[PDB]
Design a protein around this nucleic acid. Structure first.
Lengths: 99, 148, 201
RNA sequence: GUGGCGAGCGAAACCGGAUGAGGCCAAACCGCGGGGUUGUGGGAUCUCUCUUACGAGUCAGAAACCGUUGAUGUAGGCGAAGGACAUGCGAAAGGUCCGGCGUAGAGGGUAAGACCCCCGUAGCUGAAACAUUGACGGCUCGUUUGAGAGACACCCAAGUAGCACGGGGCCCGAGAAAUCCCGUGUGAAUCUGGCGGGACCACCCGCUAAGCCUAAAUAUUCCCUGGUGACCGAUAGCGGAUAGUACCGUGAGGGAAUGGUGAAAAGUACCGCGGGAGCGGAGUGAAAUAGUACCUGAAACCGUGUGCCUACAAGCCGUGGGAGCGUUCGUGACUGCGUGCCUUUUGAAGAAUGAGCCUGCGAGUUUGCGGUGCGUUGCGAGGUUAACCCGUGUGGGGAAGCCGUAGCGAAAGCGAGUC
């Protein structure tokens, strides 16, 4: 699971394309994440019982990290690299920078 | 143009014959599948060596005469007519050379036989020869040298 | 007939004579058909089996005896639900014994057919120096734009194998295992000069 | 060849292949140890002549362990390259345009067909720990007089071989029956010894029984890792989409049936009738005759509405002619003809058998260098491989064999002839 908890991602394929958002909670076993703002469902719950609007998980392969390059934002894939002590650090590939 | 592609292959006409699927429908080899009704042959096979109780063919005629020789050897034989076409100019005729001309099996005893005529001289070196063949070879100026 | 050798860049690098006995032999469709059908049949794995009324688990008892029902000898008879299969499949090898001369003649016919339409090509190499799927892609684009291509190269030439194996449309073979099915499927045949001499000899 | 010479059974020599390996004891003789190991016979014992460090190991020729180090295994890591516009409906992986990687276009998922979204693949990379297995060092073991000539007849596996009887197995079913094994009696010899070469004898040829050890080619998959399928896809495939459970039997034992909402529960808030169930609005959803009884939803079967006919008529229920009515089509007043289906029978509507109905399942298959005939294809006085070997595949090699090439005769044998 490259998508850590608490990252800025962009929905690339879904009802809501474009929308960025933070990663609320990640489920690395069923390969889904919660991005605040997207797939906000209206649960009909009874008893304060009533319509409640909260976001449902989206597939991990439907989001992708947002790295800032030359002003505006740009979606990028993520690779790894050891620094000196065999420590993998998430490295952006669109920019070659360190995310 | 449009060369041979693997979906252009077709068998020679009459090569493949469609199977005969008995037991499907009544406008074909129908319910009985070409057997008739209720006999030993409507469900089973009748062996060939069985004449309905009457003494079988193979059991009322006497055994064949005589014994057999466990050590009889048969020669591969070459008639003069077909030996005068392998050597249309004469010469020596060895056994191992006759094998290479497809006239006798490998690893056996050769015996030239006397059918036909020989017009050229042959020096045959074989395991045996018949009387008429020997005369015909010698008449044509050849010599016959037996190994056995 | 003579065909031009292409250098790895696509330039002419000489000429070669197609041996008539190999590349100008008679093409007999019935002969080619048998060999090709034999090839595809021999490729069948044939691992497939079912359980007859003897191997189904249970059913050793006679289900019952004036009962007024049908007479049954076992609960695993063919007509019963869950009973054994009658005349079902069994494992078997589908390979066919085809005479050696028919196989060789068919390959000669297939290659001769391609030659007659001018679809045999020869190259001194596929890639010069480093392994590059791009170099092979450019070379084959120069040779032909057709869908199916067959590349005959010695197995000791890793450069050509590794460079060209990933291309979707290219099927690779050793000179010694050139076979009828691959020739017919492929629109063009491309030999490496080392491969061509190895095959003809 | 064998066989109530019936049904059947059925070698060997030798040929081509896979693998390839040889060691040690008993006896005599000397004090459990030495000794010695043979088919060209060898060994002992006595006389004479000459002469007088090295190798093998974890094994069948003995047997362990200690360490150093190499490889493989049991967790893993990295691993290239896609955007825009519109549509879609709800979702772009599909449409159009331009691109990129490729030692990676295997495969799986992602809200519909993805090489570039994810997991991966090509390609590299990795082990504190323990296992498997190499190499080395330590270590252990074996040998350290030998050869020739002559003597001598001392030893060379005993209740055994052979023989008699009764049996078993070998192509051989007890036969003239060899070899091999068993029980009962009788019962040797030691190299001038003995055994076999299909009764038996002689000669000739091979070989040393009554002691032992021995890897490789060979058979198998409960189990583990990775894969494949012109294999199944919920009455199929294992009995089991987990069940040897439920249930049956005292007991050994027998032994089932039940998979599917949607991309996501967003699984229907709220309102009303009702005890509840359930339903009508409403809402979510792309879709609610997708509402947890849920994808698609056939037939038998059961209903509502509707067009036509039907209460003076005898009907294998149909078919020809035909008026009328009506949301070509639907119905069919009246009239002509007309005794079901299958099986089995000389002959069945038959009062002869089988079928209540629908749906699904259920009977000519497979093997073989088998036998035979036909068609076709390749080669053609030749044709062709089997086992097996090499290779990723279907490709190449492999002539051991088999069929054709001369037949007749009981056979010797002769041979276009032969009896």
């Amino acid at each position: 699971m490259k998508i850590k908890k608490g990252d800025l991602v962009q929905v690339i394929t879904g009802k809501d394309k474009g929308k960025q958002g933070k990663v609320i909670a990640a489920f690395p076993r069923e390969d889904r994440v919660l991005v605040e703002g997207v797939n906000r469902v209206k649960k009909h719950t009874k008893a304060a019982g009533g319509i409640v609007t909260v976001e449902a998980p989206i597939h991990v392969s439907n989001v992708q990290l947002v790295v800032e390059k030359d002003g505006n934002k740009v979606v990028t894939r993520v690779g790894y690299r050891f620094d000196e002590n065999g420590n993998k650090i998430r490295v952006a590939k669109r920019t070659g920078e360190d995310i | 143009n449009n060369p041979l592609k693997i979906h252009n292959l077709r068998p020679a006409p009459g090569a493949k014959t469609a199977k005969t699927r008995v037991g499907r429908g009544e406008a074909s080899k129908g319910k009985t599948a070409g057997r008739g009704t209720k006999g030993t042959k409507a469900r089973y096979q009748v062996p060939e060596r069985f004449e309905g109780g009457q003494m079988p063919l193979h059991m009322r005629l006497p055994k064949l005469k005589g014994f057999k020789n466990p050590f009889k050897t048969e020669y591969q034989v070459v008639n003069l007519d077909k030996l005068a076409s392998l050597y249309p100019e004469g010469g020596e005729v060895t056994v191992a050379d006759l094998v290479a001309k497809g006239a006798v099996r490998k690893n056996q005893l050769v015996k030239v036989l006397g059918q036909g005529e020989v017009s050229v001289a042959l020096q045959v070196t074989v395991d045996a020869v018949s009387g008429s063949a020997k005369e015909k070879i010698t008449a044509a100026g050849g010599s016959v040298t037996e190994l056995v | 007939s003579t065909i031009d050798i292409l250098s790895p860049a696509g330039d002419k690098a000489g000429t070669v004579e197609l041996p008539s006995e190999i590349f100008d032999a008679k093409t007999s469709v019935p002969l080619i058909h048998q060999v090709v059908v034999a090839q595809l049949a021999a490729a069948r794995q044939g691992t497939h089996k079912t359980k007859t009324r003897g191997e189904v688990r249970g059913g050793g008892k006679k289900p019952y005896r004036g009962t007024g029902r049908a007479r049954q000898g076992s609960t695993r008879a063919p007509q019963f639900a869950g009973g054994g299969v009658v005349h079902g499949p069994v494992p078997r090898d589908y390979s066919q014994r085809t005479p050696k001369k028919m196989k060789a003649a068919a390959l000669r016919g297939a290659l001769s057919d391609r030659a007659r339409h001018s679809r045999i090509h020869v190259v001194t190499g596929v890639v010069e120096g480093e392994i590059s799927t791009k170099a092979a892609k450019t070379l084959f684009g120069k040779i032909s734009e057709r869908k199916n291509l067959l590349l005959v190269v010695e197995r000791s030439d890793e450069a050509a194998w590794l460079s060209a194996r990933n291309l979707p449309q290219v099927h690779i073979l050793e000179p010694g295992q050139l076979n009828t099915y691959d020739v017919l499927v492929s629109d063009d045949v491309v030999f490496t000069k080392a491969a061509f001499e190895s095959f003809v000899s």
